[PDB]
Structures are given as C-alpha cells and as structure tokens.
Structure 1
C-alpha cells in the first residue's frame, strides 16, 4: 500500500524513493494521478529533515525527478 510508506529513521532517500515509486506505479491509481501523489508523498513522508529541506526550496519543484535531484544535492551527508 503506497499510503502506508514512510522513510525509516536509518533509510537513505534513494531507497525510500525507489520503494515509493514502485508502490505507486504498481497500484490501482490512474496514470494521470501518479506524479502528484508521488510528489505529495515525498513532501509529507520522508522524515522531517527532508520535509523541511523540500519545504524551503527557493525554486518550485513540479516533478518527482526534480525533487529527487534537489534532495540528493542538498542532503545532509551522514
């Protein structure tokens, strides 16, 4: 179930994005509703450090690929 996917405290972001995109594209949603759902799940899941990282984006991110690129650039190396 896509709506139950959370980014674990120790999980990296690319694994979380892979799992989420897999569960959203392999589901019962229409094809035209996958990108907005993936974006809004990146924003509300993806534990509050990345949540604030996406929130304070000086540019407007309108695509899952752009969000992934931005987060991978500005992520907290740890």
Structure 2
C-alpha cells in the first residue's frame, strides 16, 4: 500500500509527515475502520527515532491520531 513506504525525513517536521501520511491513508483502498490504527502504527514505527521514543512515552489512554499529534506537538 502507498502509505506503507512513507517515513518522516530527518529534516521534516512531525506534523508535515503526519499530514502526508494521513492523506495517503485517506486516499488508499483501506476500509474506513482500518485507517486510524494504520495511521497510529505508522506514527509509532515510521517517525524519526527521537519522535518514536517520544510517542512511546504517551499514556495508553491516547488512542486517536489527533491525540498523538497534540502529544508530540505540545512537547516540542
């Protein structure tokens, strides 16, 4: 899938990567209920190492892409 190769550049902001990623997922053939967990997983696995390490500190109660986005942005 198109979204599957998207990775955050070492010079790219997290929110720019998130926006690209989400656009690719929304435009893909994934069914609607698969989008959010795919997005979350890509945030966790495909962001820059420092961001991956920040995301993994988030409480398990943060479950939506929007919650992770704000978690990351609010800590920059």
| TM-score between both structures, scaled by the size of structure 1 | 0.91
Shift of 1:60: 2.9
Quote the Cα distance in structure 2 between the aligned partners of 1:74 and 1:32: 29
Shift of 1:58: 3.7
Deviations 1:5-55 (CA, angstroms, capped at 9, x unpaired): 000010011110110000001000000100000000000011110000011
Partner of 2:24: 23
2:7 is the alignment partner of 1:6: yes
SS in 2 for 1:74: coil
Quote the Cα distance in structure 1 between the aligned partners of 2:60 and 2:33: 24
Q: Please, which runs of 5 or more residues in structure 2 have no aligned partner?
A: none
Shift of 1:59: 4.8
SS in 1 for 2:18: helix
| TM-score between both structures, scaled by the size of structure 2 | 0.93
Q: How many residues align?
A: 75
What is the Cα-based RMSD across aligned positions, in Å? 1.0
Q: Please, which runs of 5 or more residues in structure 1 have no aligned partner?
A: none
Partner of 1:33: 34
